[PDB]
Design a protein around this ligand. Structure first.
Ligand code: NA
Length: 91
DNA sequence: AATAAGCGGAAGTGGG
DNA sequence: TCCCACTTCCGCTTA
């Protein structure tokens, strides 16, 4: 199964949910979710994974926080904003 | 209060 | 056995 960080990077590359997620500074790998439209993106993640329950943005962000220690995605001190690592961006 | 983002410990599920 | 990569649940903090 695709990993969450890859799901998000693929959405940013394809532009399929441009009203739910966007680059802030693509060169730095910073991206931001829509306050009003992030739930639709979370729903898509859960359906892609085949999870038992409906996915919510809260649960998706709970998973995102676990990448902080290994570095694939870090939280930025701006609303709904995160940053991919250079390794993730280069792969 | 109502609303929202952010946090993480703990236990459960998947597929190795 | 026991880690992977989350998922689910719950309670708390700050604005
Ligand atoms: Na929120």
């Amino acid at each position: 199964k695709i990993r969450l960080y890859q799901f998000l990077l693929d959405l940013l590359r394809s532009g399929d949910m441009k009203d739910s997620i966007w680059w802030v500074d693509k060169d730095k790998g910073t991206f931001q979710f829509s306050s009003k439209h992030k739930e639709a993106l979370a729903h898509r993640w859960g359906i892609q994974k085949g999870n038992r329950k409906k996915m919510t943005y809260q649960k998706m962000a709970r998973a995102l926080r676990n990448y902080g220690k290994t570095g694939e995605v870090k939280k930025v001190k701006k609303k709904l904003t995160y940053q991919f690592s250079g390794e993730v961006l280069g792969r």
